[PDB]
Amino acid sequence: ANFENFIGATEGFSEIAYQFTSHILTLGYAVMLAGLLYFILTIKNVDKKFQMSNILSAVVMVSAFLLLYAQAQNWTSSFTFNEEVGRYFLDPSGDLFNNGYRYLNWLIDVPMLLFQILFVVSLTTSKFSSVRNQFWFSGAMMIITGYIGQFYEVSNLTAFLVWGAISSAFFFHILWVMKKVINEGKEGISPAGQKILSNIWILFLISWTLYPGAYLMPYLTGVDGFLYSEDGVMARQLVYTIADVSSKVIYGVLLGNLAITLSKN
Numbered sequence: 001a002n003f004e005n006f007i008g009a010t011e012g013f014s015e016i017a018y019q020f021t022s023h024i025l026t027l028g029y030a031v032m033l034a035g036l037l038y039f040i041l042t043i044k045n046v047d048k049k050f051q052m053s054n055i056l057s058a059v060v061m062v063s064a065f066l067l068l069y070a071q072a073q074n075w076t077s078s079f080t081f082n083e084e085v086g087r088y089f090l091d092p093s094g095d096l097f098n099n100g101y102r103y104l105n106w107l108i109d110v111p112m113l114l115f116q117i118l119f120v121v122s123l124t125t126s127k128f129s130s131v132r133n134q135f136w137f138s139g140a141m142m143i144i145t146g147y148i149g150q151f152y153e154v155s156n157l158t159a160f161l162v163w164g165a166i167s168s169a170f171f172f173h174i175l176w177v178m179k180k181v182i183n184e185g186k187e188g189i190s191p192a193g194q195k196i197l198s199n200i201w202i203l204f205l206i207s208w209t210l211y212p213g214a215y216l217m218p219y220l221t222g223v224d225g226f227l228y229s230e231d232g233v234m235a236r237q238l239v240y241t242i243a244d245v246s247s248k249v250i251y252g253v254l255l256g257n258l259a260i261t262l263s264k265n
Ligand SMILES: *C\C=C(C)/C=C/C=C(C)/C=C/C1=C(C)CCCC1(C)C
Pocket: 105, 106, 109, 110, 113, 142, 143, 146, 147, 164, 167, 168, 171, 208, 209, 211, 212, 215, 244, 247, 248
């Protein structure tokens, strides 16, 4: 299956790496529940015309709470302690760790997080339907090809890499279109909102880049190095959780602040 199930079957997990990974992944879904309440409760502070952005954030929160909770359980319930070795090992009598929950979550969120900025910023010379359709197409393909390449994570490394680069192509298309969007979005609005739009752009850039970083993390120290272990698994799930909080929660808080700033007129 995956690099996680490999380590779980071929070397096992120190209680620290196991309990750490369960804790960070719990942090993950708990934060999505906190954000859900935040977006619902704040929806009154923004004019009707921006509220659709809050709505989309609330929906993203629901789909990340539900799927990142499924994955938390999947990770905990997939390994059992061995008293002889004192380490956690993949259980043959379980579901086995399965990261489809995460890709299913990305496939849902991606249209919604890309669509929502289009409800707070106005374009200048670009058409709303062109940006939208371009976001949705390459957002879906980025994920689908990323899911395919992930089927070869442990087995064929070279396929894992060439698919990753395919999925990166679509990612770079999205970063291109988002940059145009942020440029046209800057025209006209106050300097304060231009400041927030620039913050949104940097956070969008880093936070989305963390995801390919966590996809390559075990092989980053070579095909036999330090991260090729329970420590790369630890780091991979830590980066993911950081990327989840930033691109899903923090992103929508920033768009909310912008919308309020745009109601000063
Ligand atoms: C949770 C919400 C979103 C928008 C998640 C986004 C995830 C990514 C941008 C993942 C990207 C990948 C890339 C760029 C290439 C390797 C495979 C990944 C799917 C991890």
